[PDB]
Amino acid sequence: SMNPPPPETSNPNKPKRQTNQLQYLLRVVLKTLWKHQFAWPFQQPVDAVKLNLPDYYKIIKTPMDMGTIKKRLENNYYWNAQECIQDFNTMFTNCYIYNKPGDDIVLMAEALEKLFLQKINELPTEE
Ligand SMILES: CCC(=O)N1CCc2[nH]nc(-c3ccccc3)c2C1
């Protein structure tokens, strides 16, 4: 029923890059999803205490959210676009795992995911 530490957003010994694909992930993909009317439940880690979801972190062992992703991108945490793409996919999958089909939260994730897929379809070729 307690919240775990959030995912890491800083690690000085992890090697980093700033690639055109990663810049796209921040400037197009994250920015597009973040501004959406359905973004709000996804803009920070799940607060299992506030939401009274004491089983959330029993079920979800690889938590991810766009606040974390935003921090990672702004802090140049990633080596490659795949890492960041995996984070978005983890976030969506967690939602689908934890919740029931047709719940509001699932409809919200599905809308965000549709947009995500459309933007990733146009991920620029690496420079
Ligand atoms: C991040 C989406 C998720 O799976 N959550 C667990 C189930 C759930 N129900 N309601 C929410 C939620 C709504 C608004 C703000 C934060 C979380 C959530 C968060």
From Swiss-Prot:
Domain of life: Eukaryota
Changes after translation: Phosphorylation by CK2 disrupt the intramolecular binding between the bromo domain 2 and the NPS region and promotes binding between the NPS and the BID regions, leading to activate the protein and promote binding to acetylated histones. In absence of phosphorylation, BRD4 does not localize to p53/TP53 target gene promoters, phosphorylation promoting recruitment to p53/TP53 target promoters.
Site (Acetylated histone binding): N99
Every Bromo domain range: 17-123
Crosslinked residue numbers (Glycyl lysine isopeptide (Lys-Gly) (interchain with G-Cter in SUMO2)): K58
Tissue/organ expression: Ubiquitously expressed.
Subcellular compartments: Nucleus; Chromosome
Effect caused by changing N99A: Abolishes binding to acetylated histones
Subunit structure as annotated in this protein's UniProt entry: Interacts with p53/TP53; the interaction is direct. Interacts (via CTD region) with CDK9 and CCNT1, acting as an associated component of P-TEFb complex. Interacts with RELA (when acetylated at 'Lys-310'). Interacts (via NET domain) with NSD3, CHD4, BICRA and ATAD5. The interaction with BICRA bridges BRD4 to the GBAF complex. Interacts (via NET domain) with JMJD6 (via JmjC and N-terminal domains); the interaction is stronger in presence of ssRNA and recruits JMJD6 on distal enhancers. Interacts with NSD3. Interacts with NIPBL. (Microbial infection) Interacts with bovine papillomavirus type 1 regulatory protein E2. This interactions may serve for the tethering of viral genomes to host mitotic chromosomes allowing successful partitioning of the viral genome during cell division.
Function: Chromatin reader protein that recognizes and binds acetylated histones and plays a key role in transmission of epigenetic memory across cell divisions and transcription regulation. Remains associated with acetylated chromatin throughout the entire cell cycle and provides epigenetic memory for postmitotic G1 gene transcription by preserving acetylated chromatin status and maintaining high-order chromatin structure. During interphase, plays a key role in regulating the transcription of signal-inducible genes by associating with the P-TEFb complex and recruiting it to promoters.
Note: JQ1, a thieno-triazolo-1,4-diazepine derivative, and I-BET, a benzodiazepine derivative, have been tested on tumors with success. Treatment with GSK1210151A (I-BET151, a I-BET derivative) has strong effets on mixed lineage leukemia and promotes myeloid differentiation and leukemia stem-cell depletion.
Assigned protein family: Belongs to the BET family.
Free-text comment on this protein's domains from its UniProt entry: The NET domain mediates interaction with a number of chromatin proteins involved in transcription regulation (NSD3, JMJD6, CHD4, GLTSCR1 and ATAD5).
Disease tied to this entry: Cornelia de Lange syndrome 6: A form of Cornelia de Lange syndrome, a clinically heterogeneous developmental disorder associated with malformations affecting multiple systems. It is characterized by facial dysmorphisms, abnormal hands and feet, growth delay, cognitive retardation, hirsutism, gastroesophageal dysfunction and cardiac, ophthalmologic and genitourinary anomalies. CDLS6 inheritance is autosomal dominant.
Protein name (Swiss-Prot/TrEMBL): Bromodomain-containing protein 4
Residues of the whole record sequence present: 44 to 168 of 1362
